[PDB]
Amino acid sequence: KHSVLHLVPVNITSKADSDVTEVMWQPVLRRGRGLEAQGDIVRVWDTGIYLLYSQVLFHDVTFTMGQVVSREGQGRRETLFRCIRSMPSDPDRAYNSCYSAGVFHLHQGDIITVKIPRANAKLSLSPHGTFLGFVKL
Amino acid sequence: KHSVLHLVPVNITSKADSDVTEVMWQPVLRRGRGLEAQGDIVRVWDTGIYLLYSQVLFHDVTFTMGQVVSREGQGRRETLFRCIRSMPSDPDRAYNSCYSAGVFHLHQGDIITVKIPRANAKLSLSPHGTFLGFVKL
């Protein structure tokens, strides 16, 4: 039966002197042991084809927000998918969720990350606003 | 084990004197033999139920963009789902991805198409910006 995982934000992080914001995740649903949450990053234990889905909810007025979902493994990297949202100029209208997902061969030893390509991006910690999840197929 | 296919853009194609733009595809992940890409379309071989997903990344400034995912078979067109993105008027902000997905019964011999209803639509060739995929359930 399918290993699965659904994750929600515990905390947000964006180290000084870089233009990236990451999310620290915590599991709310779990089946199997082929994946594991580890602070800001999710480790893959079982090689295999996974459905990977990510939503982040933004409020910045700056041009164009979104996320980059990636895998990293054996000194390597591969951007799996991005989600791009244009935000409007008026701060009260400036709310958008950005959902993207896809099916990827993920390898044992891979760290999966979700990065917002801006420093200190204003994004929701709400469990039903920003999330990340896995289904082994 | 589940049949799967995940396709990325090699080419953008738009026959002049028509209000449509299409993508020539190429797989970057395959399992099973239920589906085959043939340039701008994807031919079904095994009848069954499929998760279909599709994302297109646009940069047009014209009102409202999106895509139409269709199956065509036995003299019948059927439109499965659409994604609609309103675009803003400032070129520097006019970037948006559009993701939709749904579960559908696909018959052997069906031709699957993804169309953007503008001529010469500007959309990304990035494999993690614009893509199309299938999972047999």
């Binding site: 991005r82 791009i84 801006r118 | 940069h59 959309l123 060739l125 990035s126 910006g129």
Partner: peptide, 13 residues
């Protein structure tokens, strides 16, 4: 930004 080399997209640069 979106032109970081790790996930560069010519489309937006």
């Amino acid at each position: 930004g979106w032109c970081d080399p790790r996930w560069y997209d010519p489309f937006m640069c």
